[PDB]
Amino acid sequence: NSVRDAYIADSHNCVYECARNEYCNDLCTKNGAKSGYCQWVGKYGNGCWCIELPDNVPIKVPGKCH
């Protein structure tokens, strides 16, 4: 569909590292997501994970952070 749970990414395919869960909830929600938190372990390791992020915003996809 038009929303998905995933690591939000910038225009360079790079995840957003995090030190706080609140940093991620803010980043995710200002970008349209329902909520978000900091993942200190996961598919791409440390980074913000968002819940229901709209598909006009990038998510980390296979490949390098360039």
Question: What CATH number is associated with residue 54?
Answer: 3.30.30.10
Copy the structure tokens of residue 26.
């803010």
- Determination technique for this entry: X-ray
Phi and psi torsions of 29, nearest 5°: -70, -30
DSSP 49: E
State how many domains the chain has. 1
Instruction: Choose among 47, 2, 11: nearest CA to 28.
Output: 47
Cα–Cα distance, 54 to 28 (Å, whole number): 10
Q: What is the resolution of this structure in A?
A: 1.7
- Cα maximum dimension of the chain: 30
Instruction: Choose among 27, 6, 17: nearest CA to 47.
Output: 17
Contact (Cβ atoms closer than 8 angstroms) between residue 59 and residue 52: no
Contact (Cβ atoms closer than 8 angstroms) between residue 50 and residue 8: yes
Containing structural domain, residue 41: 1-66
DSSP 9: B
Cα–Cα distance, 33 to 24 (Å, whole number): 11
